[PDB]
Design a protein around this motif. Sequence first.
Motif, PDB file in Angstrom:
ATOM      1  N   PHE A 118      13.164  -0.329   1.188  1.00 15.81           N
ATOM      2  CA  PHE A 118      12.880   0.609   2.506  1.00 15.81           C
ATOM      3  C   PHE A 118      13.769   1.196   2.076  1.00 15.81           C
ATOM      4  O   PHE A 118      14.640   1.423   1.411  1.00 15.81           O
ATOM      5  CB  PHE A 118      13.432  -0.346   4.135  1.00 15.81           C
ATOM      6  N   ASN A 119      13.017   2.470   2.279  1.00 16.79           N
ATOM      7  CA  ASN A 119      13.933   4.143   2.577  1.00 16.79           C
ATOM      8  C   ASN A 119      14.353   4.941   3.936  1.00 16.79           C
ATOM      9  O   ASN A 119      14.084   5.946   3.858  1.00 16.79           O
ATOM     10  CB  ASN A 119      13.395   4.860   1.336  1.00 16.79           C
ATOM     11  N   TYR A 120      14.654   3.849   4.988  1.00 18.07           N
ATOM     12  CA  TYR A 120      15.044   4.090   6.388  1.00 18.07           C
ATOM     13  C   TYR A 120      16.213   5.242   6.054  1.00 18.07           C
ATOM     14  O   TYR A 120      16.434   6.527   6.771  1.00 18.07           O
ATOM     15  CB  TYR A 120      15.589   3.674   7.471  1.00 18.07           C
ATOM     16  N   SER A 121      16.684   5.323   4.972  1.00 16.46           N
ATOM     17  CA  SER A 121      18.231   6.118   4.717  1.00 16.46           C
ATOM     18  C   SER A 121      18.362   7.380   4.111  1.00 16.46           C
ATOM     19  O   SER A 121      19.364   8.174   4.245  1.00 16.46           O
ATOM     20  CB  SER A 121      19.572   5.368   4.138  1.00 16.46           C
ATOM     21  N   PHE A 136       1.315  -7.270  -0.704  1.00 15.45           N
ATOM     22  CA  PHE A 136       2.159  -7.888   0.308  1.00 15.45           C
ATOM     23  C   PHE A 136       2.154  -7.042   1.701  1.00 15.45           C
ATOM     24  O   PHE A 136       2.538  -6.009   1.066  1.00 15.45           O
ATOM     25  CB  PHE A 136       3.818  -7.815  -0.321  1.00 15.45           C
ATOM     26  N   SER A 137       2.279  -7.464   3.018  1.00 16.31           N
ATOM     27  CA  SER A 137       1.750  -6.792   3.366  1.00 16.31           C
ATOM     28  C   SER A 137       3.268  -5.753   4.387  1.00 16.31           C
ATOM     29  O   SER A 137       3.481  -4.642   4.527  1.00 16.31           O
ATOM     30  CB  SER A 137       1.201  -7.170   5.031  1.00 16.31           C
ATOM     31  N   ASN A 138       4.139  -6.664   4.638  1.00 17.14           N
ATOM     32  CA  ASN A 138       5.880  -5.921   5.379  1.00 17.14           C
ATOM     33  C   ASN A 138       6.452  -6.223   4.501  1.00 17.14           C
ATOM     34  O   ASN A 138       7.803  -4.933   5.168  1.00 17.14           O
ATOM     35  CB  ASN A 138       5.939  -7.614   6.504  1.00 17.14           C
ATOM     36  N   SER A 154       0.631  -1.456   0.039  1.00 14.60           N
ATOM     37  CA  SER A 154       0.464  -0.366  -0.339  1.00 14.60           C
ATOM     38  C   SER A 154       0.925   1.346  -0.391  1.00 14.60           C
ATOM     39  O   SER A 154       0.297   2.141  -0.388  1.00 14.60           O
ATOM     40  CB  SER A 154      -0.979  -0.058   1.242  1.00 14.60           C
ATOM     41  N   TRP A 155       2.038   0.959   0.128  1.00 17.98           N
ATOM     42  CA  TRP A 155       3.006   1.954   0.056  1.00 17.98           C
ATOM     43  C   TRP A 155       3.961   2.744  -1.415  1.00 17.98           C
ATOM     44  O   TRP A 155       4.183   3.785  -1.165  1.00 17.98           O
ATOM     45  CB  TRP A 155       3.893   2.486   1.122  1.00 17.98           C
ATOM     46  N   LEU A 156       3.271   2.205  -2.298  1.00 21.35           N
ATOM     47  CA  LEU A 156       4.146   1.732  -3.395  1.00 21.35           C
ATOM     48  C   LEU A 156       3.512   2.280  -4.517  1.00 21.35           C
ATOM     49  O   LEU A 156       1.948   2.614  -4.274  1.00 21.35           O
ATOM     50  CB  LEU A 156       4.504   1.002  -4.098  1.00 21.35           C
ATOM     51  N   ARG A 204       7.863   2.683  -7.595  1.00 23.14           N
ATOM     52  CA  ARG A 204       8.875   3.508  -6.285  1.00 23.14           C
ATOM     53  C   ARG A 204       8.283   3.373  -4.613  1.00 23.14           C
ATOM     54  O   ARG A 204       6.518   3.470  -4.829  1.00 23.14           O
ATOM     55  CB  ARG A 204       9.676   4.549  -6.745  1.00 23.14           C
ATOM     56  N   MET A 205       8.786   3.598  -3.774  1.00 23.09           N
ATOM     57  CA  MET A 205       7.981   3.249  -2.392  1.00 23.09           C
ATOM     58  C   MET A 205       7.529   5.296  -2.398  1.00 23.09           C
ATOM     59  O   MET A 205       7.983   6.369  -2.918  1.00 23.09           O
ATOM     60  CB  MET A 205       9.642   3.607  -1.799  1.00 23.09           C
ATOM     61  N   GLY A 206       6.188   5.191  -1.930  1.00 26.30           N
ATOM     62  CA  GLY A 206       5.587   6.551  -1.478  1.00 26.30           C
ATOM     63  C   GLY A 206       7.002   6.770   0.030  1.00 26.30           C
ATOM     64  O   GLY A 206       6.889   6.225   0.593  1.00 26.30           O
TER      65      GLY A 206
HETATM   66  C1  LIG Z   1      10.918   2.854   6.436  1.00 27.78           C
HETATM   67  S1  LIG Z   1      10.615   3.651   4.228  1.00 27.78           S
HETATM   68  O1  LIG Z   1      11.228   2.385   4.260  1.00 27.78           O
HETATM   69  O2  LIG Z   1      10.661   4.072   4.306  1.00 27.78           O
HETATM   70  C2  LIG Z   1       8.390   3.405   4.810  1.00 27.78           C
HETATM   71  C3  LIG Z   1       8.151   2.565   5.085  1.00 27.78           C
HETATM   72  N1  LIG Z   1       7.583   1.630   6.055  1.00 27.78           N
HETATM   73  C4  LIG Z   1       6.701  -0.028   5.966  1.00 27.78           C
HETATM   74  C5  LIG Z   1       6.322  -0.964   6.173  1.00 27.78           C
HETATM   75  C6  LIG Z   1       6.241  -2.102   5.463  1.00 27.78           C
HETATM   76  C7  LIG Z   1       6.145  -2.006   3.918  1.00 27.78           C
HETATM   77  C8  LIG Z   1       6.764  -0.630   2.976  1.00 27.78           C
HETATM   78  C9  LIG Z   1       7.347  -0.126   3.665  1.00 27.78           C
HETATM   79  N2  LIG Z   1       7.876   1.251   3.576  1.00 27.78           N
END
Ligand SMILES: CS(=O)(=O)Cc1nc2ccccc2[nH]1
Length: 185
Positions: free
Chosen positions: A170-173, A46-48, A19-21, A31-33
């Motif tokens: 992930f985009n933690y960095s 995919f949830s996790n 759901s973030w994509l 890409r990551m939103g």
């Molecule tokens: C730490 S993050 O990458 O910048 C944002 C994030 N957190 C998530 C948790 C589960 C799935 C996708 C996820 N994207």
Amino acid sequence: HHHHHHMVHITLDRNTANSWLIISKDRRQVRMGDTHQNVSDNKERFSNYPMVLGAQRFSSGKMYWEVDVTQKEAWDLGVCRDSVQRKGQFSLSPENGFWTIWLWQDSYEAGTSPQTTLHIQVPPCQIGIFVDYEAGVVSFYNITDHGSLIYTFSECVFAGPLRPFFNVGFNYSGGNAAPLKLCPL
Ligand SMILES: CS(=O)(=O)Cc1nc2ccccc2[nH]1
């Protein structure tokens, strides 16, 4: 390699996406939103992890496609069974229905169990993926280094239809926002 003539036009399946994509209008980039992308939940997503599947299903033949990974710090690529687990935690392994490689923390590894170190002298900006269904082979190629072989899974037991598999990471960095892009034929 000489697999280019088996090129297939892959598109991403929105309904499977975490759901973030953010999948582009042409369904060729993801890409990551920076937040939830305002979609309903469903049993396919995919949830996790920041994962999505291609729409295409393969049950025979030879297939080839390419993916752009320019300036990413982490990602997973390959194929998977159509019936892989979507919810909760899991490892990418052939036992779980995945044939993948990844980049993580400045090293490349194949998704065997346990994982296998890859030997890449030229960091790839585009990856080629070849599937031979009948032979039970999934191979990965370094397009940046004149198509050199990265890894071959052989004696694969697919045990179902296959789908193209993607993880943008992930985009933690703050250094991994760049998209995965399906490259034109
Ligand atoms: C730490 S993050 O990458 O910048 C944002 C994030 N957190 C998530 C948790 C589960 C799935 C996708 C996820 N994207």
